[PDB]
Specification:
part of a larger assembly; 10 chains; A: 197 residues; Jelly Rolls; four-stranded antiparallel beta sheet; C: 116 residues; mainly beta; Genome polyprotein (chains B, E, J)
């Protein structure tokens, strides 16, 4: 189930599902990053794994991310895809991100890649006396830098796009069912007592 | 590389796979003598013909298309005549969607088939009328495709049987649809089980302006049967 | 059969606006662009702009950016064009033509014209 | 872009230049005095379906022309041109 | 079609061949207890990672590039930290050079690896300094590529292990380099065995102007080992 | 090639023509009175990384334009254009 | 961070020459072209030419073929521009911009200017 | 299309502009006063088989030029240009 | 060896016509186009048109549409050009050149010229 | 992918098939001692060499080409010298026609070989002379290709051995021709058995003007023999 890569503001509609990589883009410029948080607002809030695991409290398992390139047939170039373990923070430059766990993916050979996320965990932690909320710490990141420039011919357009997917593996577990706040409490129903009269 | 089904034959495709929606075929009503016991006529040779629809146009600003599958064939051909003077049917379908663009176009479609797609009107308290649903052969258009016109998001819409048309790699999709209904036989003029919907996620682009990239949809009823119109006495 | 039936002629005092229509029948309306033309009496013609009834994107000529607006209705199968701030030099005949399936500008079907 | 058509009136090779190159992409129209318009030549050499076959068009980089062999009574009509290369698309002056 | 080596993996290449320079692999020091007898630590899991370098630009007027292989990795990553606080190493390398251009570009490269490339200054009697040789990660540039900056011609430079990148046919090259030195273990901060050098023989051309055609070099130490830093007493 | 920009001063759709066709390939710049310049629109429709999203550009064959929805105090600056199609590359006159 | 630091202003009597500099820091200098501009006080700008510091090929505008020369230094990471035969109409501000990795002319980084 | 050549006489960089872009596609000719013509440069940079190698040509989008290093006695001849991009193909004015 | 031998000079009173020839020898005649030129005495040259001796299709300049006609003979290996309605301004030298195998207009072989 | 026949070799073709004209090869005169009983010299090593002809030009307005096969080789090479000082020959041929255009050209040729093609003059009562038939290496040109210059139509001209060169699919054709004559041995200076003729049915087109699309014809005598010039007494 696809996620919302384009995490910038003022992206309204179904323009949130894609990032453009124009010909006039300088090297080593960060395209996106995904904070691997289900319960928090980000690219993984409104997916299929992030709506079933609202009803449950504790989750722990491994994931599986898949990207896909939607450019023309002629266009080439390379990217680089890092994974940050839950200890360290998000890298900002390409050179400090290459020393992590990376793969160097190009465009001409394949148009889809697969990136196994090893392990996540989470809870809700209402630990005090009053009604307080303690957010879980930020586990993991997946960030992407531009290795070389995009190369298109004189006939194709100079803008391409990416689409990202996500799916849990077969050891994703859930426990202690609760109720999800996703809709909102209650609003005006137009005929709220059809049954009574 | 051709699909010779009965009278017609869609020839010269690209390599394709019969991804069965879920895990089943039509099956021909294995055993129900408890219901409508006039044995179904079961026509087989005179319905299976790949009724190709009109070609639709894909421009940059386009937003989506939808067809109701027992409704798109009520007025077309030999299946269209058997909908009148019969009131029970039972059939599964086969869908072949094929667009055609050169090696300088770029884009992506999502060909999804939705069981029991109850639509919804935007920003009013009135249910949709008879004319906003029974559009016919021409189909329709999504007004708000991000929520599939009923509030359920498009990001989770891959839970249904679906394939991708990515113009870099392929230009074809094929879905086989079984009989998805609670009742054993249904009424064709007022209920629509499936809803074929194709939605461009990544819009197209080229150096010049508004290339058409026309698309073709072809539908064929698989294992159809109807009530009995001929009885002894 | 493709027919492009326009409205009858009309006239107006200066400082006003006016709206016309080019009703089309005989084909699928949402596939073809609807171009609009202008011919002063005794001279050549001039392109005003088009409307894309599949998307409602319009593209105007640079001279007619502030004068005319272009809309398109799907239900009644009718394309409209509304002028604004009429002067003495707006007295002309106005046409409507049809594009092609692939978005090319070669016109095979035409209207009859409507004086102002 | 501006296109000029060299004869202003005709009393039978009607030529029209162009400001730039247009790479084909030129149509020939005709207007009856009743008010009906139909095209004659599309893409500078082909003929429309339903025209008498005496019409023909030439081709070059920038200077195109129409050729009529024999004349006729209702052949007498003002003839226009059109470039569809780049928007805004412009006609010509016309003859006759 | 991927080179998964340890932590990183260069994925999705074209078909390629491990042309071993000469006829051998790294080999791991078969038997020398007579020299430096503190057994080598031999790190294996934390050095082999395809350190990709910066992408270089290939224009019409470009003339060549060179890297010194134990020098290009002295300040990069886990191999770069083991060069400090160790003074003996022993390793072989693996090089993967890959450029990417469309089907309208034309050109040819010569990817050659030169053992013990002693350079020379043009038109002076002074030997090259420390700063003209230890350039680092950025590498260098041939001033006179026809004589390889030491008088020996380029026409005979195919005696070394080499491959061709001809943009009509392929866009990739792969060389495996063994331990080429007289001494069994060497000093990394002052001696450089190999010298990777790529030289465009036929310059590129296209209808438009100065297309970049960026190139990528990726280096990975094969079977590395160092001195012992931990001893009993 | 020469490019002209039709309004000379502004007191909010700033259009600029061209002598030829340029096939996209147009940028929009802005100059603060302190002396700093940063671009706003590149390739006639896209937006720069770090601009308020009220700016937008139109597209055609030869007549391009900028669209601003709402105004602001330090929005008041002279706006230039640029064609990068063929050398020598030329700016426009500017507004405001 | 990309910075394009130019020299301070200077002036000269006619019949002389002058040389300026646009020192760049924050990126790899030998990958990007270095374009130079001219703005008369109160008017629009004008392209002079560029220098390719990877190759030292220069391409000038036709008006400025005999006036200006363009060099580039790799060691000090500084691009120069020298005028010749100064007149009264050379009083302007001179800029320096940076190209792109792929050789396109869209400028995202600029200098501050240097009066003459 | 019109091409102009800026020096009218020479007493050694002979440049010629163009009305449009020509994308290479320019030749350099020379005419001896006896009446013989042979070309010197074809496709704006290459040299003909049998020319002294002191001639060289520059390249741009629209402004091309010839470069001669040293002069000679029978080098003194009027030099022409030619664009072969689009018909009708036009020469230039010439120098010397 | 490629040779383009033209006829000797001739002159004519106004109101008449004249025909010349450019006989070619040393190559296969039916593969190359035969371009014709015009130089007024003291000015630059001008393209008139060509003839395709493989097909006998001709393409003229727009100024010389009514003046000159162009033919080509295969047997005698000779290209002709006939003027019509001579005036005072037709006094010039007329050339003939040869194209290339691929139909490009770069001329390596020439005639000597023929005054009118 | 090469045709190494004797001294020369046409290398690097596309995949091709030896479609034998009718059903036979040359065969070498199985048994005739009743005719011309000086045993044929039968040269084999010094004639079979793929004499390639001149490249011809295919433009939009072109109309066809024809060669007479014992006549096109009378003045070329070692077969051309054996035609003088011999008066009987017996040989079959092999023809390889190959044009070359890019993926933006479109067109179609018909490569046909016509036994005993007696030509005819248009609109006169005089038979064709010696000079309108014995053209030589340069070949000829159809004046009226729709009737093959003798009244028999082109629509029925596929009864002869033929192949198609369709520039969308292939660019090569290969025909093997046996000895087609009533007499066992024939006279080379006045009789011409076969007549290779290529005719563009669909003319070519592109956006620009008059692309050449040059074609190459290559002929090689298969199993040739002549009379005896050397006798005992």
């Amino acid at each position: 189930s696809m996620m919302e890569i384009n995490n910038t503001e003022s992206a309204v509609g179904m323009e949130r599902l894609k990032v453009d990589i124009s010909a006039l883009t300088d090297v080593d410029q960060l395209l996106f990053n995904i904070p691997l948080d289900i319960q928090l607002d980000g690219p993984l809030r409104n997916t299929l794994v992030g709506n079933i695991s609202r009803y449950y409290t504790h989750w722990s398992g491994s994931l599986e991310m898949t990207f896909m390139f939607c450019g023309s047939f002629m266009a080439t170039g390379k990217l680089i895809l890092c994974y940050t373990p839950p200890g360290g923070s998000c890298p900002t430059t390409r050179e400090t991100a290459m020393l992590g766990t990376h793969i160097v993916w190009d465009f001409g050979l394949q148009s889809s890649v697969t990136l196994i996320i090893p392990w996540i965990s989470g809870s809700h932690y209402r630990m005090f006396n009053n009604d307080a909320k303690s957010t879980n710490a930020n586990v993991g990141y997946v960030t992407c830098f531009m290795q070389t420039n995009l190369i298109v011919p004189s006939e194709s357009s100079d803008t391409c796009s990416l689409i990202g997917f996500i799916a849990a593996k077969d050891d994703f577990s859930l426990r202690l069912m609760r109720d999800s706040p996703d809709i909102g409490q209650l609003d005006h129903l137009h005929a709220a007592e059809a049954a009574y009269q | 590389l051709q699909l010779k089904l009965g009278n017609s034959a869609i020839v010269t495709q690209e390599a394709a796979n019969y991804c069965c929606a879920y895990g089943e075929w039509p099956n021909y009503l294995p055993d129900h003598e408890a219901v409508a016991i006039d044995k179904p006529t079961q026509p087989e040779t005179a319905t299976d013909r790949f009724y190709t629809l009109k070609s639709v146009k894909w421009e940059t600003g386009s937003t989506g298309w939808w067809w109701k599958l027992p409704d798109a064939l009520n007025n077309i051909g030999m299946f269209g005549q058997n909908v009148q003077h019969h009131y029970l049917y039972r059939s599964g379908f086969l869908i072949h969607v094929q667009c055609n663009a050169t090696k300088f176009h770029q884009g992506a479609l999502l060909v999804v088939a939705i069981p029991e797609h109850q639509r919804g009107a935007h920003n009013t308290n009135t249910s949709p009328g008879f004319d906003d649903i029974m559009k016919g052969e021409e189909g329709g258009t999504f007004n708000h495709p991000y929520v599939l016109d009923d509030g359920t998001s498009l990001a989770c819409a891959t839970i249904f049987p679906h394939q991708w048309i990515n113009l870099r790699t392929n230009n074809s999709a094929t879905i086989v649809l079984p009989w998805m209904n609670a009742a054993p036989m249904d009424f064709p003029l007022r209920h629509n089980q499936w809803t074929l919907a194709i939605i461009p996620v990544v819009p197209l682009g080229t150096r010049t302006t508004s290339s058409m990239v026309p698309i073709t949809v072809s539908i064929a009823p698989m294992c159809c049967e109807f009530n009995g119109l001929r009885h002894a006495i | 059969q493709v027919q492009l039936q326009q409205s009858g002629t009309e006239l107006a005092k200066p400082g006003a606006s006016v709206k016309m229509s080019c009703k089309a029948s005989g084909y699928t309306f949402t596939n073809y662009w609807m171009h609009w033309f202008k011919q002063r009496p005794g001279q050549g013609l001039e392109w005003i702009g088009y409307v894309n009834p599949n998307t409602d994107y319009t593209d105007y000529n640079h001279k007619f950016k502030d004068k005319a607006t272009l809309t398109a209705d799907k239900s009644s199968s009718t394309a409209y064009m509304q002028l604004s701030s009429l002067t003495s030099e707006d007295s002309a005949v106005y046409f409507c033509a049809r594009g092609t399936f692939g978005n090319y500008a070669s016109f095979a079907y035409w209207g009859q014209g409507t004086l102002v | 872009i501006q296109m000029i058509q060299s004869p202003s009136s005709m009393f039978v090779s009607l030529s029209c230049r162009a400001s730039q190159d247009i790479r084909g992409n030129l149509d020939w129209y005709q207007q009856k005095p009743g008010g009906t318009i139909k095209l004659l030549i599309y893409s500078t050499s082909n003929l429309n379906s339903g025209v008498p076959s005496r019409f023909s068009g030439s081709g070059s980089g920038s200077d195109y022309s129409l050729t009529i062999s024999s004349l006729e009574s209702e052949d007498f009509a003002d003839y226009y041109c059109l470039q569809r290369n780049a928007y805004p698309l412009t006609f010509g002056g016309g003859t006759k």
